[PDB]
Amino acid sequence: GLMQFTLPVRLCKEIELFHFDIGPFENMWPGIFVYMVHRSCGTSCFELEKLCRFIMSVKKNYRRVPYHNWKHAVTVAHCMYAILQNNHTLFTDLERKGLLIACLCHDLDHRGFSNSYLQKFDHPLAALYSTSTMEQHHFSQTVSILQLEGHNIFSTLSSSEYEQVLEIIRKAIIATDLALYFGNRKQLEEMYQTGSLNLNNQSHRDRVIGLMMTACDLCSVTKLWPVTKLTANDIYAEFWAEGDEMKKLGIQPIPMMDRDKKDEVPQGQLGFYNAVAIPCYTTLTQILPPTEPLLKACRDNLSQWEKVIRGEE
Template identity: 45%
Template sequence: MFIDLNLVEKFRINHEVLCRWVASVKRNYRPVSYHNWRHAFNVCQSCFCMIKTGGLESIFSDYEKLSLLVSCLSHDLDHRGTNNAFQAKIEHPLARLYSTSTMEHHHYNQCLMLLQSEGCEILSHLTSSEYAHVIKLVQHAILSTDLAIYFKKRNEFFNVVKSGAADWLGNDGHRELLR
């Protein structure tokens, strides 16, 4: 997917580093029933298909494509198989650390940790401003997987689409909803 979207060449991602990063992401998924590596890979494959066959390749920038693939693969890292409400009810340390979107903040922080791990730095050739931009997009994408946020944004998205006023290229708010 990274190769087919020309992201490896565009961002000068070393093939070995990419493979090591993907293997590290896979290893950091727990063997839970649903929020596991297979689920993450399926989400990434679905996103890739939407980009390639859904007309999004010409809409999204290379930075957005990169951030979406990274986000899809990382969006449930170290998931414990329980939801945010459960984490809060048992007063898990993660719930004390993050007051909202508990698990999603944890997944995002796990993603950052892996991206910064020695030998897994797939973003190492980005400038500091490019890196900050990609990380901001990754953060937004992963935090948006909190179902409380997702259902709110889903309604906004469908309202934009139904209105016929969707401007994926010129309206940053619409573009954010699409991502």
């Protein structure tokens, strides 16, 4: 109870910033996550014995794939931490409990393939879940791990609070389906501009949390350039593996996933920043002003990809 997690000074300071990199020492990521829960939620939110056991079962159920791995889980949870800390009073005790856990669990048992590849492969998961295939699986895996003996980190919640938190976590994890992002941002855009957005309306909160989840999930584009650039390699390593698999099914993959079209990556980053990232962080800043640093950092990396195209790097 009187046991706080502390970090080294540089991590203590840098962890509060949106652009924080959790570093290459895997064995520190659990301590980093617990540190964030304790400062975001309270030392009382979770029974430390159960939290630690939940974290290590979650870690175990992430795979050794190049991008959608344990490091991504913790990076995405750190971005959510940054948002919750910079927007203290806007979120319930239950939302702070659910969203950090949601973020850690959001890509559980990811195989490094898109929903599209599961469907064209005719993977069993694509029959069980017709849309947001991987995302419903990630939630299913979260509920599985929550029901392991000793793993129920929400045991102190009432029946109805327990259901509220598993419902926050489910919508939060479904929202990481980037196909659901576009519509969700347009609705939030229209709602903000007409002045109809209302954070006491539960369906409005849901949309806002969904946008945060997109924001944290894409947060690789909000890092300092050398981090963003090096993460790009891991991202394309999955994309190109999937393209390879598409070719094995007899299907020309989209260029994004075709390793024969590496040359076009810088232009592909531009599209993604303009079509997805910038709109995402723009709308998020409108709703949550203190998240502006994510927009600024995103715009900085757009400018850096523009420099790559111009042959200046």
